[PDB]
Amino acid sequence: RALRVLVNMDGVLADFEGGFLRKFRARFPDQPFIALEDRRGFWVSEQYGRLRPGLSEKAISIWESKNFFFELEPLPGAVEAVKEMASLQNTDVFICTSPIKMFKYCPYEKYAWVEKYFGPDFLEQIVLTRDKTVVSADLLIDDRPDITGAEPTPSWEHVLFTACHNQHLQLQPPRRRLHSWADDWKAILDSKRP
Amino acid sequence: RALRVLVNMDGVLADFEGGFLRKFRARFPDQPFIALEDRRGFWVSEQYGRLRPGLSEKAISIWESKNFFFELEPLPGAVEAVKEMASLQNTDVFICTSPIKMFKYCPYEKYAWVEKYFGPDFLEQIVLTRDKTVVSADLLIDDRPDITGAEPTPSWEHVLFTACHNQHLQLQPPRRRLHSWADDWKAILDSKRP
Ligand SMILES: Nc1nc2c(ncn2[C@H]2C[C@H](O)[C@@H](COP(=O)(O)O)O2)c(=O)[nH]1
Ligand SMILES: Nc1nc2c(ncn2[C@H]2C[C@H](O)[C@@H](COP(=O)(O)O)O2)c(=O)[nH]1
Ligand SMILES: [Mg+2]
Ligand SMILES: [Mg+2]
């Protein structure tokens, strides 16, 4: 009866796309790269693999490296918006994130990143899972278009958060977008309340 | 429509109680300790704090230390039972665990422990959260008596897994126990199926 909102981390709170591109270019300066505006499809390494052989593996090595997740910059307005959202009456916010398969740094750095931008008390709001459909809530704000898993009927409405990779996608009505944290996330929340 | 079962980690799959006691005694050999049979109440540091001042903090330092979670032994039958359970038709198993507040090692070591005993492919089945009520499923097998959080009506039935700390507790009917992994977990699963 508190409205419950799941907010994805990478591509919603944390600027994974920009951080990746920057780090890829510093480490592989004589390789071709995908400009952010040219990004298409969720999977970064797939697009890089299509661009040139061997490049999928180089791309992967960026996000597998120490400090990659920790050093991601917040997306504009993300921190302010989630902090306001969590302080709203009758509203519980969880940060829901799918860690990569290589687990040496990513889980740790995600907790550390949340501590840095939201504070120790916000660590209680983290959910790490590869399956978001088994987390129940009224809303999921997430930049991945296709969110599936073990539950064929999730309780949340998926609101697509705009990113380079999905900005041109035509969704099936009545699927809805949140265009950036400057867009009116409060009205989306209010539309789900009694 | 696949039956979905959440299986807690510490005190259900991983022998947190035995591992803690062993490590506490090697590190603090001239301190009093709580024998496993004398354990009461979920919170280990609370009982240790009652036993002597300063001892809560020493207890905490054990599970905050590097390799504490990684080096926990599986509880008897736990690995075999969960592997069988996951291979059953129309049955999805997730391992659901609440990491401690100090996040340097615990998340990482939990993924590592799952990889060691269940294999890389089982990493997809991990859910880390401090709030289990927001994970939906038919069953939650968990040794903690009081499982609460943001969802006042969880979709799972909590089956209490026996541990030293809870073995004397009288539950409110119709709450049910799984007494150990030698006990008949298949009949509990079957009672929830259509
Ligand atoms: N394995 C893999 N992971 C990717 C690729 N592209 C992006 N990712 C990462 C970015 C995020 O860390 C993660 C998805 O997590 P999420 O934003 O929580 O849905 O996947 C890719 O091509 N391959
Ligand atoms: N902070 C704290 N954690 C405890 C205490 N006793 C046990 N724990 C840990 C054991 C597990 O790692 C964790 C509970 O996780 P879970 O088994 O998933 O419900 O809490 C205690 O007194 N204080
Ligand atoms: Mg994302
Ligand atoms: Mg437990």
Side-chain angles (χ1 to χ4, degrees):
Chain A
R1 196 267 355 255
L3 192 80
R4 180 188 316 134
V5 186
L6 309 176
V7 182
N8 186 224
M9 202 168 167
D10 291 305
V12 176
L13 299 181
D15 185 11
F16 178 98
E17 295 279 356
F20 166 74
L21 178 53
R22 182 165 320 118
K23 272 179 177 181
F24 179 91
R25 290 186 82 183
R27 185 173 158 188
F28 298 117
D30 304 330
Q31 290 296 325
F33 64 91
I34 309 283
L36 300 179
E37 326 87 64
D38 294 322
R39 280 280 294 104
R40 299 279 186 284
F42 190 64
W43 301 118
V44 173
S45 71
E46 284 183 3
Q47 216 186 344
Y48 271 74
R50 239 124 50 198
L51 184 63
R52 159 117 117 207
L55 225 46
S56 175
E57 293 71 23
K58 294 188 172 39
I60 289 162
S61 68
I62 298 300
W63 62 75
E64 288 187 0
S65 299
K66 192 176 196 187
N67 292 322
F68 177 73
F69 288 94
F70 182 65
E71 287 175 2
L72 294 178
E73 291 292 336
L75 287 156
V79 173
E80 177 200 17
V82 168
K83 272 171 185 184
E84 190 182 3
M85 179 188 311
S87 77
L88 292 176
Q89 306 295 246
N90 291 306
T91 308
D92 297 323
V93 176
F94 292 83
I95 296 170
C96 187
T97 177
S98 300
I100 55 162
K101 301 151 194 195
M102 211 291 280
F103 52 75
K104 185 71 202 83
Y105 315 114
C106 163
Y108 160 66
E109 287 187 14
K110 280 177 176 283
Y111 286 92
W113 191 94
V114 172
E115 173 192 75
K116 173 166 173 151
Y117 290 109
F118 299 97
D121 288 344
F122 225 83
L123 302 168
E124 302 181 53
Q125 308 306 303
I126 297 164
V127 187
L128 306 208
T129 175
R130 300 268 277 170
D131 192 341
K132 298 164 185 155
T133 73
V134 307
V135 188
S136 62
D138 296 283
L139 286 162
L140 172 58
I141 305 171
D142 197 303
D143 64 303
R144 184 173 178 170
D146 60 301
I147 298 176
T148 60
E151 176 52 53
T153 49
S155 51
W156 34 253
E157 181 189 349
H158 177 177
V159 176
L160 182 75
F161 192 88
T162 299
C164 54
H165 66 79
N166 71 33
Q167 70 182 328
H168 299 236
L169 279 183
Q170 175 188 175
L171 307 172
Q172 49 268 226
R175 294 198 165 166
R176 208 130 62 116
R177 283 178 179 264
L178 182 63
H179 290 16
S180 68
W181 287 108
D183 192 10
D184 189 356
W185 56 262
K186 285 170 177 178
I188 297 169
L189 270 64
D190 296 340
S191 72
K192 304 303 284 191
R193 300 185 187 278
Chain B
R1 196 267 355 255
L3 192 80
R4 180 188 316 134
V5 186
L6 309 176
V7 182
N8 186 224
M9 202 168 167
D10 291 305
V12 176
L13 299 181
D15 185 11
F16 178 98
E17 295 279 356
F20 166 74
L21 178 53
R22 182 165 320 118
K23 272 179 177 181
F24 179 91
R25 290 186 82 183
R27 185 173 158 188
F28 298 117
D30 304 330
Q31 290 296 325
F33 64 91
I34 309 283
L36 300 179
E37 326 87 64
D38 294 322
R39 280 280 294 104
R40 299 279 186 284
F42 190 64
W43 301 118
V44 173
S45 71
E46 284 183 3
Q47 216 186 344
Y48 271 74
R50 239 124 50 198
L51 184 63
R52 159 117 117 207
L55 225 46
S56 175
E57 293 71 23
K58 294 188 172 39
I60 289 162
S61 68
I62 298 300
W63 62 75
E64 288 187 0
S65 299
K66 192 176 196 187
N67 292 322
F68 177 73
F69 288 94
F70 182 65
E71 287 175 2
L72 294 178
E73 291 292 336
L75 287 156
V79 173
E80 177 200 17
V82 168
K83 272 171 185 184
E84 190 182 3
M85 179 188 311
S87 77
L88 292 176
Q89 306 295 246
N90 291 306
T91 308
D92 297 323
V93 176
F94 292 83
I95 296 170
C96 187
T97 177
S98 300
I100 55 162
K101 301 151 194 195
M102 211 291 280
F103 52 75
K104 185 71 202 83
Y105 315 114
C106 163
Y108 160 66
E109 287 187 14
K110 280 177 176 283
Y111 286 92
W113 191 94
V114 172
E115 173 192 75
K116 173 166 173 151
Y117 290 109
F118 299 97
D121 288 344
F122 225 83
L123 302 168
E124 302 181 53
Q125 308 306 303
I126 297 164
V127 187
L128 306 208
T129 175
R130 300 268 277 170
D131 192 341
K132 298 164 185 155
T133 73
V134 307
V135 188
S136 62
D138 296 283
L139 286 162
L140 172 58
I141 305 171
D142 197 303
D143 64 303
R144 184 173 178 170
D146 60 301
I147 298 176
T148 60
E151 176 52 53
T153 49
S155 51
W156 34 253
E157 181 189 349
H158 177 177
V159 176
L160 182 75
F161 192 88
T162 299
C164 54
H165 66 79
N166 71 33
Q167 70 182 328
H168 299 236
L169 279 183
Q170 175 188 175
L171 307 172
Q172 49 268 226
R175 294 198 165 166
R176 208 130 62 116
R177 283 178 179 264
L178 182 63
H179 290 16
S180 68
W181 287 108
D183 192 10
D184 189 356
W185 56 262
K186 285 170 177 178
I188 297 169
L189 270 64
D190 296 340
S191 72
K192 304 303 284 191
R193 300 185 187 278

